[PDB]
Amino acid sequence: MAGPSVTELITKAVSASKERKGLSLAALKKALAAGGYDVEKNNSRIKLGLKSLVSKGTLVQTKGTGASGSFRLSK
């Protein structure tokens, strides 16, 4: 646990993703803009709880350019 909200939300979908290791900040960060949030009117929490989820190391994507960089969650 890191934050008191988005992490609980994003980090919650961390394993409840709806695709195959390929969110694109449009899947995980898009599960928080469902009811009372849009990763837009509050984008400063999705690209912060995700920029922090994927980056921190939870959702360790794999920055390899569109081709080999998604998020397999932890290592």
User: Helix fraction?
Assistant: 25-40%
Silhouette: globular
CATH topology: Arc Repressor Mutant, subunit A
Rg, rounded, reads 11 Å
PDB class: chromosomal protein
Keywords: chromosomal protein
Assembly: monomeric
Entry title: homo-and heteronuclear two-dimensional NMR studies of the globular domain of histone H1: full assignment, tertiary structure, and comparison with the globular domain of histone H5
Task: Tell me what you see in this structure.
The protein is an all-alpha fold and 75 residues long. The two termini are 16 Å apart. The protein has three helices and no strands. It has helices at 6-16, 43-49, 53-56. The chain has one domain: Arc Repressor Mutant, subunit A, CATH 1.10.10.10. The chain is globular, with a radius of gyration of 11 Å. α1 (6-16) packs across α2. It is classed as chromosomal protein.
Short description:
The PDB classes it as chromosomal protein. With 75 residues, the chain is mainly α.
Jot down its keywords:
0% strand; Arc Repressor Mutant, subunit A; chromosomal protein; 75 residues; monomeric; mainly alpha
Which secondary structure elements does this structure contain, and how are they paired or packed?
Layout: H1 6-16, H2 43-49, H3 53-56
Helix pairs in contact: 1-2
Subcellular location: Nucleus; Chromosome
Family: Belongs to the histone H1/H5 family.
GO molecular function: double-stranded DNA binding; nucleosomal DNA binding; structural constituent of chromatin
